[PDB]
Design a protein around this ligand. Structure first.
Ligand code: SF4
Ligand SMILES: [Cl-]
Length: 410
């Protein structure tokens, strides 16, 4: 039985059935914008809450926004970056690579195992949310993890292999998956139509909060610009005490699918970061000790060099020049898909050459695009850490939200 068939089997069970399980679903933003195309409509032609209603009509007991998991990734990865930056100032290496794309993680383990220490140990947004629901939420609702089923709807054909990583399980039992089944945008679209469900004709439903209390998806109003940018912002604003605006990446000449930006950071006055810049300034990626600037009275500062690679072919050319020292970066994100997740392998096929641009544009409302969201300000995220996880990068956070990598692959 395919994973789609297994999830549908769990849903086919009446809710009052003695063997019925608590079936949960989480949905990626890339899915929500592209799902309307399965009806022959434009991207974004169906609202988020219409999809929520549709999923609830399939029989899901919980409907979650993957963005909640993304806030956890931003928290952990932002802290991780700040940590590595900190220990490199006072003399887990640099540059740091992000790790949300399983296509990158796969290529990392098979072709570049010597780069493993440089990669963030953060789990993906979907896996963090999954680990959370079968731990915190299970305990809150008095449900055994074995009686909870976690489904994700993804734009990606690789998110199942990510989920199937052996140790992504509960209490060292690899049969108790943190995330059981992954369904693609087109597969979900096919399920709706085969049941006569038209999303565009549905009323607005509502999301569930992974914290098990309150209303909404447990995510505040506004946008972050994605995990990488928000992780950067997290580190930046703690380091400088000043807000980081939305990033504008510029294309690197001579390199396809590579974008970059330079971010200058002056430590906040009186901070530990100001002490470290002052009191001390004298592998496969040996890293030049950083890009720093200073001046007359000692306005000491460091320049964070960031790169983004789409996709895997273009990424190899970047790594080559990095090892050659021709490309110098501190923070690198590698996505397997040329257009990123909005153009993932699980997305509808279109004749429109600009379909990925339409998807991106329709991702959020002009209202939401104008408002900056910060993960550490999310009351649900604050509560989860204060009352359950402890500190980011800590013991509990490492066990539930972090992972490891295997040289040679799995
Ligand atoms: S870039 Fe492609 S392969 Fe990587 S996470 Fe996004 S959809 Fe999946
Ligand atoms: Cl994810």
């Amino acid at each position: 039985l395919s994973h789609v068939q297994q999830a549908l089997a769990e849903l086919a069970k009446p809710k009052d059935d003695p063997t019925r399980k608590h079936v949960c679903v989480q949905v990626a933003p890339a899915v929500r914008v592209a799902i309307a195309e399965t009806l022959g409509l434009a991207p974004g032609a169906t609202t988020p809450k219409q999809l929520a209603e549709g999923l609830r009509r399939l029989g899901f007991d919980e409907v979650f926004d993957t963005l909640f998991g993304a806030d956890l990734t931003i928290m952990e990865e932002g802290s991780a970056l700040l940590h590595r930056l900190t220990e490199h100032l006072e003399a887990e290496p640099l540059p740091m690579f992000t790790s949300c794309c399983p296509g990158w993680i796969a290529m990392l383990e098979k072709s570049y195992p010597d780069l493993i220490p440089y990669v963030s140990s953060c789990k993906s947004p979907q896996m963090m949310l999954a680990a959370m629901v079968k731990s915190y939420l299970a305990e809150k609702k008095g449900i055994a993890p074995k009686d909870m089923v976690m489904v994700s709807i993804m734009p990606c054909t690789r998110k199942q292999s990510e989920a199937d990583r052996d140790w992504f399980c509960v209490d060292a039992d690899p049969t108790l998956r943190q995330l059981d089944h992954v369904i693609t945008t087109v597969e979900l679209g096919n399920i709706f139509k085969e049941r006569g469900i038209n999303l565009a004709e549905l009323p607005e439903g509502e999301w569930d909060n992974p914290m098990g209390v309150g209303s909404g998806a447990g995510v505040l109003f506004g946008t972050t610009g994605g995990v990488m940018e928000a992780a950067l912002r997290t580190a930046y604003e703690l380091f400088t005490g000043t807000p980081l605006p939305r990033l504008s990446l510029s294309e690197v000449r001579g390199m396809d699918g590579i974008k970059e930006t330079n971010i200058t950071m002056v430590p906040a006055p009186g901070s530990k970061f100001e002490e470290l810049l002052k009191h001390r300034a004298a592998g496969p990626l040996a890293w030049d000790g950083g890009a720093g600037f200073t001046s007359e009275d000692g306005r000491g500062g460091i320049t964070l060099r960031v790169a983004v690679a789409n996709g895997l072919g273009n990424a190899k050319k970047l790594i080559t020049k990095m090892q050659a020292g021709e490309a110098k970066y501190d923070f690198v994100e590698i996505m397997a898909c040329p257009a990123g997740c909005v153009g993932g392998g699980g997305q509808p096929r279109s004749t429109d050459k600009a379909i990925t641009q339409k998807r991106q544009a329709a991702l959020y409302n002009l209202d939401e695009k104008s408002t900056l969201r910060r993960s550490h300000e999310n009351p649900s995220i604050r509560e989860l850490y204060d009352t359950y996880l402890g500190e980011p990068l800590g013991h509990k956070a490492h066990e539930l939200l972090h992972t490891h990598y295997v040289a040679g692959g799995v």
